[PDB]
Design a protein around this ligand. Structure first.
Ligand code: 46L
Ligand code: 46L
Ligand code: 46L
Ligand code: 46L
Ligand code: ZN
Ligand code: ZN
Lengths: 371, 371
C-alpha cells in the first residue's frame, strides 16, 4: 500500500473531498480525527471509535512522552499495538501542548525545556524521534504557536523560528529511513493574523516540502469571525495538491465554515470532553442532557442520528446516567458525539462530491442555529 | 414461558446445578448476578454484560426509588426498557440498604423512615410496590438485617419482625395480580449465628411460601469461617426444591465454598467496584494492575481467560489506563472481572453436572491461593 497518496475526487468553490491512502488505511476527507490524548479516545474502545466512522485518530505526544513514555511504548510494540487501533494515527508535535500544559518552560532556538504537571525537553529532533518511537503515521513538525494577540514583529520572529524548526523537523524525519518510508510529515504555517507573514510561512514550508500543511496559530482565542478571516487568505497560500489541516477545531459550524475555506482535516476535544460533561450535539444544536427538561424524554439524543446509542437509549436514561456520575453516561454521550461528528463529515463529503455543499451548509446552519 | 420454574439437573454433596426458567429468560445455577445499582452495571453496556455470560442482574431499590424514582421509571416503561436489559432483573428489598446508606433512620413495626444521602419511608408494602413499578422479575421481601454481633434476644426479636415483614411482603405481592403472575418472590432467612433462630426463621418462611430463599444476615463482618459455619446448618433448613440465594457474596473462594454448602445464587459489588479500583481477578489470585510490576507486561490480565479484554489488551496497557484515571481502564477491568466471575460460575456448573465439583474446588483453591 502507498505511504501517502492524496487524491481529490471533487471540488466546490474552495471545498474539496477526496482520500488519503496510507499503509494502515484510507482517510476520507474532509476528515474529523477523534482525540486520543493518553493512548485512548476517552470512554471508547477502538472498535467503537471505528464503528462511528473514524478513519484516523490523534495521539498527544506531550502526554505520551511523559506517561507511559515513548521508549516504553516502543518497547511494547508501538502505539497502535499498545492501544489496539490498527488504522492511521496522527501525532501532534508537542510544540503547542508544551506551552499550554507545562507548569514552567524555558524557550530557546534549540527547543523548549519544561516541567511536567505530573524537567523535560522538546525540540524538532526530539519531537520527531518521539513520534518515531510511537510509530505514528502522520508526524507533525515541531512548531511554536504564536500567542494571540501578538505584535507584527513578535509574530514575525516567532514564525521565522517555527520555519527553522520545520526545516529541522524535515531533516530529522528524512534521516530515519523507516520513518520516511512508512509515515508522512506535515508542516505548520504560522504568522498570526498577518497576511504577509502567513505568505512568507507558506513559501518557506513549500520550499522545504511537506506531505500536508496545517494552518497553525488559530483557535487560540481569536473567535470564529477572525479565524475565518485568516483562513480566507491563508489556505490559498498552501499547496493545493496536499491536505490542509486545522488543529483544535471545532464546533460543527466551525468545521463547515473551515471546509468552505479549503480545510481537509480537523481534530478537536469538544465531542469527547463535552460529551463527558453532558453536552450532546444534535442537528438542532447542542443540548445539555442534564437539564431537567430531558428527565422524561423518551426520544434518543437525536432522532435522525444513525449511531448505536440513538438506536437503543433515551435522553431520559442518559440524563439519569450523567446526573448520577455513571461511567456509562460518559460512554454513551461520547459515542454519540463522535458518531455525530462523523455523520457531519460524511454529509460534507457527500455534498461536495454531489456539487451541493453550498446548499448543505446553508441548510445545516439554518437548522443548527434554530435550536 | 413460565413465570418461575426451578429444575435441578445434577447434585454433588450439597451442591446443585440447574436452571430457573422465567418469562424474560433462563438463569443457569449456580448463578452470579452483576450488580446494576443505579440502573447500570457500572462501566458496561447491557450487551457487554450479556456477552460475559450473565443471565440476570441486580437492581438497587433504595437507590432507584430516590433517583430517578420508581414512578418515573414506571412512566418510562419500566427498568428493563429504561436501561436496555431485556433479561431477568432481581431487585433488592431495600431493608439492608436503608440501614447501610441512610444518614438517619427511625425503625418501627411499620417499616423504616429515613433521610437520603442525596425524608422517605420503606415498608413491606412500599418495597413491594416500588419493585412492582420497576418491573423486576425477582422481588425480594422487605427484611431487617440483624447487625453483627447481636445478643440472642435481639437477634430473636429482629428475626421475628423480619418474618412478620415477610408475610406482609407475600400478601402485598399476591394482591397485585400482574406482579404475582409475572414475577417471583423470595424470602430472607434471619437469625444471626443462632441455629435455633435460623430454624424458626426457615420454618416461618416455608409456612408463608416463597419461590426462593435467601440466607440473610451474612457478609456483615463475621468473616468467611463463621459465614461458612452458619451456612453449614442454615441452608439445609430451607426448602430443597427452591433456589437458595446468598446476598453480597463474594470473593471467588467465598462463592466456591458457599456452593459446596448449597447456595445457588449470588450477587456482589466486588468485580465491578474492585475492577474500577485496579484489582483484577485471575485464576492465580487477584492482582493490582496499578502495581509497577505490570508496566511492561504484555500478557493479558489472565492468560486463560476467554473474555474480549484478554483477547485484545495487555496488562501494560490497562496498567497505564488505570494509573491515568482513564474511563477505558475502568471499562476493561470491569468487563474482565465480570467475565471472570461468569467463567467461574460456568466451571462450577460444569463440574457439578459432571460429578467432579469436589476436585474442581480443591484444584481451584490450590491455584488461586498459590498466587
Ligand atoms: C528523544 N526522546 C525519546 C525523548 C526526548 C525527551 C524526553 C523528555 O524530556 O522526557 C523524552 N524522550
Ligand atoms: C487549539 N490547538 C489544539 C492548537 C492550536 C494551534 C496549534 C499550533 O499552532 O501548533 C496547535 N494546536
Ligand atoms: C410506594 N412508592 C412508590 C414509594 C414509597 C416511598 C417512597 C419514598 O419514601 O420516597 C417512594 N415511592
Ligand atoms: C452484604 N449484603 C449486600 C447484604 C447482607 C445481608 C442482607 C440482608 O440480610 O437483607 C442484605 N444484603
Ligand atoms: Zn446518536
Ligand atoms: Zn479476561
Amino acid at each position: 500500500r502507498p505511504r501517502f497518496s492524496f487524491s481529490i475526487a471533487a471540488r466546490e468553490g474552495k471545498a474539496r473531498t477526496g482520500t488519503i491512502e496510507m499503509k494502515r488505511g484510507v482517510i476520507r476527507t474532509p476528515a474529523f480525527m477523534p482525540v486520543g490524548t493518553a493512548a485512548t479516545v476517552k470512554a471508547l474502545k477502538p472498535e467503537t471509535v471505528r464503528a462511528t466512522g473514524a478513519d484516523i485518530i490523534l495521539g498527544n505526544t506531550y502526554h505520551l512522552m511523559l506517561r507511559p513514555g515513548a521508549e516504553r511504548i516502543a518497547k511494547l510494540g508501538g502505539l497502535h499495538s499498545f492501544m489496539g487501533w490498527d488504522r492511521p494515527i496522527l501525532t501532534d508535535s508537542g510544540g503547542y501542548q508544551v506551552m499550554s500544559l507545562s507548569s514552567l518552560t524555558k524557550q530557546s532556538e534549540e527547543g523548549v525545556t519544561f516541567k511536567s504537571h505530573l524537567r523535560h525537553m522538546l525540540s524538532p529532533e526530539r519531537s520527531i524521534e518521539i513520534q518515531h518511537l510511537l510509530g505514528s503515521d502522520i508526524v507533525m513538525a515541531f512548531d511554536e504557536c504564536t500567542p494571540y494577540p501578538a505584535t507584527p514583529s513578535r509574530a514575525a520572529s516567532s514564525m521565522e523560528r517555527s520555519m527553522r524548526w520545520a526545516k529541522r523537523s524535515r531533516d530529522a524525519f528524512d534521516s530515519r529511513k523507516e520513518q520516511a518510508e512508512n509515515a508522512a510529515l506535515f508542516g505548520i504555517q504560522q504568522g498570526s493574523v498577518f497576511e504577509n507573514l502567513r505568505q512568507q510561512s507558506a513559501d518557506a514550508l513549500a520550499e522545504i516540502g511537506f506531505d500536508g500543511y496545517a494552518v497553525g496559530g488559530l483557535a487560540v482565542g481569536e473567535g470564529q469571525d477572525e479565524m475565518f478571516r485568516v483562513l480566507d487568505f491563508s489556505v490559498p497560500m498552501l499547496p493545493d495538491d496536499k491536505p490542509h489541516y486545522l488543529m483544535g477545531v471545532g464546533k460543527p459550524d466551525d468545521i463547515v465554515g473551515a471546509v468552505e475555506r479549503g480545510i481537509d482535516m480537523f481534530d478537536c476535544v469538544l465531542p469527547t470532553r463535552s460529551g463527558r460533561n453532558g453536552q450532546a450535539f444534535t442537528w438542532d444544536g447542542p443540548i445539555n442532557i442534564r437539564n431537567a427538561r430531558f428527565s422524561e424524554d423518551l426520544k434518543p439524543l437525536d432522532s435522525e442520528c444513525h449511531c448505536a446509542v440513538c438506536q437503543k437509549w433515551s435522553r431520559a436514561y442518559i440524563h439519569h446516567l450523567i446526573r448520577a456520575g455513571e461511567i456509562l453516561g460518559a460512554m454513551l454521550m461520547t459515542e454519540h458525539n463522535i458518531a455525530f461528528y462523523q455523520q457531519l463529515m460524511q454529509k460534507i463529503r457527500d455534498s461536495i462530491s454531489e456539487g451541493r455543499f453550498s446548499q448543505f451548509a446553508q441548510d445545516f446552519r439554518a437548522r443548527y442555529f434554530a435550536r
